[PDB]
Amino acid sequence: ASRYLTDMTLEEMSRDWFMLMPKQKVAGSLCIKMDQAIMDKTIILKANFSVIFDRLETLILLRAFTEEGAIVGEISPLPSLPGHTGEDVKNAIGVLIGGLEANDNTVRVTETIQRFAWR
Amino acid sequence: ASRYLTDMTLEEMSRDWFMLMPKQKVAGSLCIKMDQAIMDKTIILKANFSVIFDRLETLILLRAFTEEGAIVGEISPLPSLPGHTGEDVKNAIGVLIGGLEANDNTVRVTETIQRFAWRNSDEDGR
Amino acid sequence: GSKEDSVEAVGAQLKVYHQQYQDKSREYDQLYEEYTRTSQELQMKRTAIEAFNETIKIFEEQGQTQEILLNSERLKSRIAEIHESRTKLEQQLRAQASDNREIDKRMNSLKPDLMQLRKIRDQYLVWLTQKGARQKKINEWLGI
Amino acid sequence: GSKEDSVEAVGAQLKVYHQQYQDKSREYDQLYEEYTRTSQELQMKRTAIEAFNETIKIFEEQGIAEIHESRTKLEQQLRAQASDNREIDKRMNSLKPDLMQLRKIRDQYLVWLTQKGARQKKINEWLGI
């Protein structure tokens, strides 16, 4: 079927956040920001995205949260630029995960991401 | 459920067209370009768009052609702005058809357009 | 100026989309509460008519154990009234089931537009956030 | 030097997307041909088995045992080939969503480039004419 799944609320999506050491990549039309100042932390990825045919189709927004609740990373579609495919998001998520792991951070994803996006 | 219809070909979507009297309006994040220098013509609306739940969801591109193939109108999502809803596309089709009929033009829509998001009734015959 | 006017206009359109989603979800909540209420009523009526069925099964077993005057003829009339009341209760039960199905129809006719509005609202919010709109401006556009 | 740079990057991305589409399309067509071919082969084998056990059973109502082993091997062949054809079906079933999404995304990138001032020659240039 088709279902638009959401892990984050309006506040988590609109929340302001800061990067002391901002590292940014641009995969296709997807921007992957992360704070390289985060080391030895437990971080969880939360994503709002659409699904068709039990497959990830379009990412609305993904954000990384510490156990306390501070946003230290983000995967977002770039404004004023064309869309993307499911494989683009699948690769961007792995990019962010590797960037967090290099800083000795263990990364976990929600039950929603693990069913349609995996690692 | 969930399909992607295309009335136009790659050449038709990529083809260049010129407006003698450009009339560009904005419906939501959709841009409606129209050559109001067109008069006393029969115009067909051909559109590529995705459907879900047998309803129009996302418009990829709509264009308007004369009998000889020339382009006279277009409805397209603006590049710098976010997406749209099906009602936005219906409103855009309505605006384009009304503006076109205002110049003694006989607008007709394709069957695929007439299924999901459709407007227009009939014009006389100039 | 131009680039700021466009951001403000996209914020206004986000406000429009958010209010539309609020209205649609309000309507859907109304219909869902009505659906749950009528489903509970249908379950109650099912249980009642099932008790009726049990009693009339006792009636079958006790009517086959006979094979006059008025020792039994006086019962076999009010008990036919009870049969008629059971079938009338079911005539009400199915009539309510029809309305419940129509409510389900109306809700499933809303689900597509509801999901589309929610997704496009979140997308406009993400766009504005990427254009440098702080959380205060986003909440201004949303309303609260 | 900036806007043109973004347009050129989106054009190269359109190149990549068109390549992905016309590669997965070749894959899907290669699999569709094989699906129809193996379908017709198994169709023939079904009626062959029909005739086999038909002659085995009808002419047995009165009273040549290698035909039984022939039917055994034919059943085994049809079973294995049906498994292979079902795997081909499962493989080409999971390409239709990717194909539809790739086609829609390529057309959307085409329209974005068109609205940003890309002529038909530029689009055909990114599309391999």
Author numbering:
A (entry chain B): 81 to 199
B (entry chain A): 81 to 206
C (entry chain D): 433 to 499, 521 to 597
D (entry chain C): 433 to 495, 532 to 597
Please, what does the article write about this entry?
To reveal the mechanistic bases of long-range epistasis and how strain-specific mutations reshaped the energy landscape of NS1 during evolution, we first examined the structure of the NS1:p85β complexes. The structure of the NS1:p85β complex was available for 1918 and PR8 NS1s23,35, and we determined a new crystal structure of VN NS1 bound to p85β in this study. Interestingly, the conformations of NS1s in the complexes were almost identical, with RMSD < 0.5 Å. Although the complex structure of Ud NS1 is not available, it is reasonable to assume that it has a structure similar to other NS1s, considering the sequence identity in the binding interface. This result indicated that the complex structure is not responsible for strain-specific mutational effects on NS1. Given the structural invariance of the complexes, we hypothesized that the structure and dynamics of NS1 in the unbound state are most likely responsible for the strain-specific epistasis and thermodynamic signature for binding. However, there was no difference in the binding among the later strains of 1918 IAV; namely, PR8, Ud, and VN NS1s shared virtually identical binding (kon) and unbinding (koff) rate constants. Notably, the kon value was highly similar in all four NS1s, including 1918 NS1, showing that strain-specific mutations across the NS1s have a near-neutral effect on the p85β-binding rate constant. Indeed, PR8 and VN NS1s underwent the BI-BC dynamics on a sub-ms timescale. The analysis of slow-exchanging residues on the NMR timescale revealed that the population of the BC-like conformer was ~99% for PR8 and VN NS1s and ~90% for 1918 NS1. Overall, core interface residues showed positive epistatic interactions with strain-specific mutations between 1918 and 1972, indicating that the binding interface mutations have less deleterious effects on kon values of NS1s of later IAV strains. This trend reversed between 1972 and 2004, with large negative epistasis.
NS1 of an influenza virus is a multifunctional virulence factor that antagonizes the host’s innate immune response and is associated with many strain-specific functions in viral replication and host range. Especially, many mutations occur in the effector domain (ED) of NS1 that interacts with a number of host factors, including retinoic acid-inducible gene 1 (RIG-I), tripartite motif containing 25 (TRIM25), and phosphoinositide 3-kinase (PI3K), during the infection cycle. To this end, we selected four NS1s of human IAV strains that emerged between 1918 and 2004: 1918 H1N1, Puerto Rico 8 (PR8) H1N1, Udorn (Ud) H3N2, and Vietnam (VN) H5N1. Although functionally near-neutral, strain-specific NS1 mutations exhibit long-range epistatic interactions with residues at the p85β-binding interface.
